[PDB]
Amino acid sequence: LHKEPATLIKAIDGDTVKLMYKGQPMTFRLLLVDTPEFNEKYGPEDSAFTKKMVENAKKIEVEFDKGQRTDKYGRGLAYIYADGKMVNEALVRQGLAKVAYVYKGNNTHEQLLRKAEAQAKKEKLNIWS
Numbered sequence: 001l002h003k004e005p006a007t008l009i010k011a012i013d014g015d016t017v018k019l020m021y022k023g024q025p026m027t028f029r030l031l032l033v034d035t036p037e038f039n040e041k042y043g044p045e046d047s048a049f050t051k052k053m054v055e056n057a058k059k060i061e062v063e064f065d066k067g068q069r070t071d072k073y074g075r076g077l078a079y080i081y082a083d084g085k086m087v088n089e090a091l092v093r094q095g096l097a098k099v100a101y102v103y104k105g106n107n108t109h110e111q112l113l114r115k116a117e118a119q120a121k122k123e124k125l126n127i128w129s
């Protein structure tokens, strides 16, 4: 897998963000995660968390997996990095997302995220509290 450049256009919610990628606006859906919706318990806190992480980054990167790069809604499916730190992993590690939507051939970081979920859950964070 390889990191590629992108720039923030706007934070949307916990697990989607609008980025510029190869010079075109795209909504990205974070691979391998699922955040509570805004109206749900922790929904505002998961939006805040992603928004801060992407709005504060000096450098946003996009990393596609080995499988499909866009979902059925036209969202890009990637791992997103903010100053070298994976947003997908960080949400999970903070108990603001669950590992979810694990499809074969787009699952390179599954075990990494599962480990982070186990630590969040051990720490009773947020959705595990």
Ligand SMILES: Cc1cn([C@H]2C[C@H](OP(=O)(O)O)[C@@H](COP(=O)(O)O)O2)c(=O)[nH]c1=O
Pocket (backbone or CB within 6 Å): 029, 030, 031, 032, 033, 034, 071, 072, 077, 101, 103
């Ligand atoms: C994360 C992800 C979601 N999706 C689709 C499946 C779900 O379909 P349905 O809309 O039919 O439920 C939806 C979940 O996204 P949200 O959690 O953003 O709603 O996005 C993929 O197809 N591939 C993926 O890797």
Ligand SMILES: [Ca+2]
Pocket (backbone or CB within 6 Å): 015, 034, 035, 036, 037
């Ligand atoms: Ca969601």
